[model samples]
Structures are given as C-alpha cells and as structure tokens.
Target: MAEPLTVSPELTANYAYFFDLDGTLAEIKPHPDQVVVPHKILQLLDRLAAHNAGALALISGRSMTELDALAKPFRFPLAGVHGAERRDINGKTHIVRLPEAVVREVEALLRSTLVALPGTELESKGMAFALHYRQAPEHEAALLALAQHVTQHWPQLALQLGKCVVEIKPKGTNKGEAIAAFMQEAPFAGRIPVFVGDDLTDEAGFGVVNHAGGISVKVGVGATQAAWRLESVPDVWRWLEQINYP
Candidate 1:
C-alpha cells in the first residue's frame, strides 16, 4: 500500500472531494441489491462537512432515488444517472430524463434480457438501463453481446462497462460533465477537486480533476488516468479514518 500523495495545505484549503459510490465508497458486492456503507465513512464525511474548507459529493450511475435509498440519512450533493440528474446543497434537484421512445425501447429489451438470465437484475434510471450481472458472472459475455446488439439499433445510445454491470445511456452525458457542472456552483466553484473512483467509467472524472490541477485517486488494480491508487475499499476506509488525525 503506497502512501497517498501528501495533500498540501494550499490544496486542503480549497479542496472538494468527489467519490464514486460503488467501488470507491463501498466494495462491489456479489449482488447489486446488497451493499453497505461503513459507518467510518459516514463519520469521515461528517467531518468534511463540518470543516468549511471542503465538500463531499457522490457521482454515480444509479438514479437519484436509488442513491438516496443507499445513502439514507446522509444527503450530500449527488450526481445520479452519470450526470442526468443532480441534487445541490440547497435541496434543489435537477433531472434529465431520456426521450419516451428511447426509454420504452431500452426498457423492453432490458426487461427481456433480465428475464432470460437468472440472478440478474435490470435497473431503470429513467435515462438509462443498467443490467447487473454480479450474480451471473458466467453471463457477462452474453450480456455484453446483448448490449452491443441494442446499441447497434440505437446508435445514439452508448454502453458503459463497470465492475459487474453494463449501463446503456446517451453518448454525451458522462462523469466529466457531472464534475464540470458541479464546479460551477457554490462551495464547489473555485475549489480543487479530488476524485476517487475504481472503474473505467470514472476516467472522465479523473481527466477533469487532473485538468483542474487536483488529485485523482484510483481504487483497485488497473491502469487509469488517476495520479495515485488506493488498493481497495478497505484501504480507502483506513485513509478516511486517519484523515483528521494529523
């Protein structure tokens, strides 16, 4: 476990932390429906909020409703559906739903696909459909093929591969856009953005942070745009626990 880069006082003074929910905040479980956020993380987040120098935000592909359920009682700023929806600190919410025709087409196909695969689940985020194959690892290839087939039919839609699922959404909306949008608002505006994530989907966010002269920490093993890497979820939790010690 290499040490995380030393966060300079200047950096800490204007820092904003952006995290990806699944692999960054918590481990990727065998089932999408079963995930637990450690109490330590929630406490660290409380500390960050208590300090006026920073803000914490979760950027995820999950819908606002799903994220809200998973992050019960802790309602920080969040970007859902990859940036299709956002909730600001003022309790204001913004959403970007897909076209009705596109939504219906994808939902029908995703429903059929999920029905055919045992132990699989289809999550509809209004703007996209996520086919979770965490319980059906053997069906990964088949699922990707199915998604490719659908994308061919709707060239405007794109496929985003994650730890154990594949998401279908419009091509333009991504984590980079979400970070950029967040940076334009209060607290986030003019702050140094540090993004922590573990999947390829988070590369866009890494790019954004790097371009802004901020730090990007990647979790798990793999090549990434992140400047530093944290081994796993436990490693992240340990770091969070020690955040205020110094």
Candidate 2:
C-alpha cells in the first residue's frame, strides 16, 4: 500500500502511539467510573513504550486521576480530560482551566435541569463536565439539546458531543492539540504517529495525524477522518500486541 498504516514493519521505535481508552482499548461502561481498563495491556504498553522511548500515550476524556488509577503502577504520558489537561514525559501537567464562576453556573444549571431526567449522571471535572446517557439511550436527543442550550449561554465553554455522552468544557486545546504537543516533544518528535480511537472527540486527533501524514485508525465503524479502521477492541489489542513484538 502507498499510504502508511499503523500495524506494519514500520511500527517500530519510529512510531508514537496515541490511543483512546473507552471503546478503543477498553469496553464502554454505563458509568464513567465503572469502566475498568484491561490489566493485560499494561505489560504490552510498557514494552511498547520501552521500544519507542516513551512515546505511547493515552489521549482520552478520562481525567488524569482516573486514567492513572486504571493504568495503575504504570503511568506513561497522557492527555487527560480530552486534551484539556496533559502530562508530558517530564511528569509535569498542563491544564486548561475553566473559571470557578462558570463551572458553578454550569453545575447549577445541570443539577436543576437534569435531576428529573432518568438515567442521567453528571460528572464534574472542574474544567469540564460530561453528562453520560449510556443507561438511558432514549434521552440522547434531550441530553444533547440540553447541553447545547446550557453551553450556548457560556461563550467560553464549548460542547463536546460524543457516543452517549455530552461534555461542556472550555474552548481551546483539544485532542488534536494534545497530539501535536506530544509529537513536538522528545521521544515523539521526528517519529510517525498512530492515534486510534472510536468516538467523535477523536476526530480532531485523527485530523491532526492525517494532516501530519501519520497513521490514524478508527477502532470501530462510523464516519471518521481516520485513514485506517479496526473491527473492535479485541482487534485493537491484537494489533497493538503485534506491533510491540514485531
């Protein structure tokens, strides 16, 4: 093939892996906190990072705390909060914060509005909040509309619509920025990138990677900017495992 793909002989130390957690390497959970990452993948990830000189990173919506907890005892680089906050290879974190007033206002609005909505849960991330409707798929339209309506009043905040979830956060950095930032740093610089995800939020990252002439894989079927696609989570892991060993 003329185009670059993620899994190949070229998948060596010259490649940087940026992966999304839920619906990618891990299964989706009804609740955000209820999701448990695959423990077996940690060893493979560690080995992969070892070969890549620490270029592997989790570019996901989960907060740093949650990501860290799930990938327990094996912390690599990551862009948590869907790139709103990132911790580089140096262990230092950079955060794009939302004003306390704005967060309070948003929280108040959500609490008052969504309390009556069934199977809706609000997760506050200080700088952002996501309302998950995985348990109540029937309310997807209402949740999206409500999120859009609430965010419209807050100019600084933007709406991040994803699979069964709607998040409101400050507008600035995104998964694209997260990928670009890491790729600009050591271990990542000069290496080809391969970011894999299965959600709308990941489209930004796919755009960034595609424009950079890197490999971007969409881990499940849907309209995506990614050039490559895998069938499911098992396929994702199997492919990753192959890359590490190859």
Candidate 3:
C-alpha cells in the first residue's frame, strides 16, 4: 500500500508486469466477447510497457485470438488459452494444438449436458472450450460438478474454474508455465515477474511469480496465495498508478 516503496527496485529491470484482463484490470462482463476496455487502461499499459522496454504481457484464460483484440487497437505479448498459446517479445507466437477428435468429443459432451440449462452458454476456443454460467449464478455448483467430471473422458484435458465459468484446456501447461516461458527471453528475461490476476485460473501464475521472488497481487480475493492484495479493480488501478514504472 505504500506508494514510493512499491517499485523500489530491489532488482532493477527486474519487474516485468503481467496482468489478467477480466476482474483484475477490467470489470466482469456478461459475455467475455462483450467486455469493453477503457481507453485509459490501454494507455496506462502502453506506458507501463514502454517503461519496461516492452516486458509487460497479459496472461488470461482467453485464447490468443481473443486476446489479440483485447484493449482494442493495442497489442502486447501474452499467454492465452491458459498458456496453451504464448507470444514472445518479438511478436512470435507459439501454440500447442489439441486433437480435433478430442475437441469434438468435449464439445459434444458440453452441448448435450448443458443444452437444457437456460443460461448456460458454451464457447469454443479452437483448442479448448468453456461453459459460462454468468447468466445462471444459481447453477454454479452443478456447472462445476459437470466440468470436473468431464475430465475423465480425456486424460490430457483439464478443467479450469473461474468467475461464473469453467474451461477445458490442456493438462500440462498453465499460466505458470507461460510466465516461466516469458522469463526465458527478451524484455522479460532477467526481470522479476509481477503477476496480477483475480480468478482461480491465475493461481498458478501467483505461485510461480512468488517462487521467483516477485510480487503476486491478488485482486478481490477469495483465498489466494498472492503476496499482496488489492480490494477491487479500482484499487488495482490506483496501486499501479502510484508506482513509478521503471
């Protein structure tokens, strides 16, 4: 919470900023596609990226294609699909593909299982899929139960639960692995990683960042492992603004 002490540079060029879009930087939207980004937020990130020589990146459960349109006409390095797809500092993208048959199997299960649920909507992410229940908060328990159970059908698939949503992604790679990948090259290399996120999906990111002796800020927490906590999206904005970016 201290302004001057926050970016004190215990390790110079060591702070590479990584953020989660929904809930952390932007307010939750009814549909992820309908989420709108503020002009100021984009500019702040642009400035932050500039300060870090383009070391900043976004790590979200959203796919790289989805993240590509994020913050509107602005772009940055990112890991999407829960790290299944990652982009490095030079704008090179790396992706892991899922079997077409496996994807079809998962889609079929979700559609069949959730068709009758009035508010449940399924999203296909090429290599992954997500069942969003933002429209049916009462169905949270049922949705979670179904997602966890569906994993038995595919050994390499995993379920990722977030705010009113459940996603099926590749098992081995996650946001933590994405962070580790980012640390390997360019503007991000040799920098202390600071990951800011609000959902359960970002927990892996928090763990890896902490292990690397970096700051992990949890926004609007619900039992998190983050080293620092900010009360809301606004608090996260204010906290970042107070620090003088290097």
Model 1 lDDT tens row, 1-246:
323545433324667878898888888877757888876687776676557444778898888887878777778889988887888877798877567998898888878878977977888777787888877789899888988888889877888988788888777878999999888888788878888888978999999888989889988888887888888898777776666555
Supply the global lDDT for candidate 1.
0.80
Ranking by TM-score, best first? 2, 3, 1
Model 3 spans > 4 angstroms off: 1-13, 244-246
Candidate 2 residue lDDT tens string, 122-201? 89888998998888898888888988888779888889998888988778758999999999999899899888899999
Relative to the true structure, candidate 3 has a C-alpha RMSD (angstroms) of: 2.8
Candidate number with the higher lDDT (1 or 3): 3
Clashing pairs in 1: none
Best by lDDT: 2
Q: Rank by lDDT, descending?
A: 2, 3, 1
Candidate scoring better on TM-score of 1 and 2? 2
Query: Ten residues in a row with the worst lDDT in model 3?
Result: 2-11
> Where is model 2 more than 4 Å wrong at Cα?
1-6, 9-11
What's the TM-score of every candidate structure? Answer: 0.91, 0.94, 0.91
lDDT (Cα, tens digit) per residue for candidate 3, span 1-246: 311114433222558989998898888878776776577778877877887888899998888777778776888998988899898988899998888888888888889978988899998888778889989988888888887887876878898887888888888878999999999898888888888888898899999998999888888858888878777888777766655443
